Design a binder for this molecule. Structure first.
Ligand SMILES: CC/C(=C(\c1ccc(O)cc1)c1ccc(OCCN(C)C)cc1)c1ccccc1
Ligand SMILES: CC/C(=C(\c1ccc(O)cc1)c1ccc(OCCN(C)C)cc1)c1ccccc1
Lengths: 11, 222, 218, 11
């Protein structure tokens, strides 16, 4: 689990 | 072209994403019901574990380890609470009115009242969550802001002195290029790009404010 | 709103027009020095209230919101003013033309040398960027509108007020970019410099917070 | 005397 598993990402 | 100033915008984003720290669970022992830390002990224990990961994250930020050790420690000691806080806000954005300290420790505003003086700080973090939601802050933007906080917060607090401040400012400029590129690639006009960059940077003054108030509180409860 | 229909050149003109008087101060001890600084500040606050009412957008807000913004910003505004007028004096703070102090003298007030060093560092940063007055005046208006916006407070009106403030902040951004373009900066240089300027506001916040802490302690 | 009397200005 990191920040990359939360919220919206441009890509 | 593997050094920091040689990286393209895409390569910088990619490097920063690779360096993202783990999101920790709050430690729990079902066999120790009665020595469960107070609210403050739970947050302290979490934060201290996060700080170990933070040092290693900072030292993976391209450019950071080009500084002398003394300067690295300085920047870290200035930025650490801002960095915990923005990380907290990111993961809390999908939980309006709440703060996701950890996947197993999701707290509402009124739980902030468990520590005198802490609710003020919870309120400010919640307003940040709300600001980021209203902007539709994207993950790659959050990741650039963290690095900006690391490099910026202690820079203002002799030849090589100036040399090091020069290098920091160059890396900061590369992260700005990186933010702009992300926005441009997303199809924002130049005007929308400059307006958005400014909106994001102004939130950093609020994050500074929150960290100042938190440090004050920590130092009071010594 | 007057504010949103202003061109970049007209915004600059309005902010220049609004600039307050630079005051003259009327051995040292901690007591006397804090006395001088307190007297000067209290006089500058009178002029600051009238300045703020001349910042495009500010008068469109309720009197309650105007007071709140000034209560949050006032020390930041005094400090950035100080940094600006100290820019051409390496190693010194020009509190007034007749009160020019170095850091040795900061140590008069226990706790103040920390703040004095931070101010000098900001002054040195301004100098290092060759900050121009039009940019300084924009930054000062940003502090006014921005510093207390996240701590407003429950009504539709209030949400409408915040939207207004953000709209004006966007116009000040456009104005900075305009000034920089007119100065012959590249698009790349324009965004880099916009970022450099706005990042200084985090440091001005930090200094105001340390200042407020000191003032409360005493 | 104002800020205008100090520093550099674009104009
Ligand atoms: C606002 C949440 C918080 C902390 C926190 C923030 C984000 C996060 O992911 C985890 C915790 C907090 C609490 C205690 C703390 O102390 C660490 C002590 N070490 C540094 C010796 C740090 C942050 C806190 C900070 C200051 C005062 C009261 C509470
Ligand atoms: C950094 C100089 C300074 C003040 C100052 C800054 C800029 C300026 O143009 C004039 C003064 C300062 C000192 C005292 C002060 O008291 C205000 C109390 N009034 C509002 C009742 C305000 C600013 C100061 C602030 C806090 C602690 C120690 C010193």
């Amino acid at each position: 689990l990191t920040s990359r598993d939360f919220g919206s990402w441009y890509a | 072209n593997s050094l920091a100033l040689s990286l393209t915008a895409d390569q910088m984003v990619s490097a920063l994403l690779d360096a993202e720290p783990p999101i920790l669970y709050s430690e729990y022992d079902p066999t120790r019901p009665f020595s469960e830390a107070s609210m403050m002990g739970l947050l302290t224990n979490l934060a201290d574990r996060e700080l170990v990961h933070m040092i290693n994250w900072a030292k993976r930020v391209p450019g950071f380890v080009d500084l002398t050790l003394h300067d690295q420690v300085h920047l870290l000691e200035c930025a650490w609470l801002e960095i915990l806080m923005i990380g907290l806000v990111w993961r809390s954005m999908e939980h309006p009115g709440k703060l996701l300290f950890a996947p197993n420790l999701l707290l509402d505003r009124n739980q902030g009242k468990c520590v005198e003086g802490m609710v003020e700080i919870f309120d400010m973090l919640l307003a940040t969550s709300s600001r980021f939601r209203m902007m539709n802050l994207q993950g790659e933007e959050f990741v650039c802001l963290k690095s900006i906080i690391l490099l910026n917060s202690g820079v203002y607090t002799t030849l090589k002195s100036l040399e090091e401040k020069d290098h920091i400012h160059r890396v900061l400029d590369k992260i700005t290029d990186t933010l702009i590129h992300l926005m441009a690639k997303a199809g924002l006009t130049l005007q929308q790009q400059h307006q958005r960059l400014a909106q994001l940077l102004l939130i950093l003054s609020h994050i500074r404010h929150m960290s100042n108030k938190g440090m004050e509180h920590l130092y009071s409860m010594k």
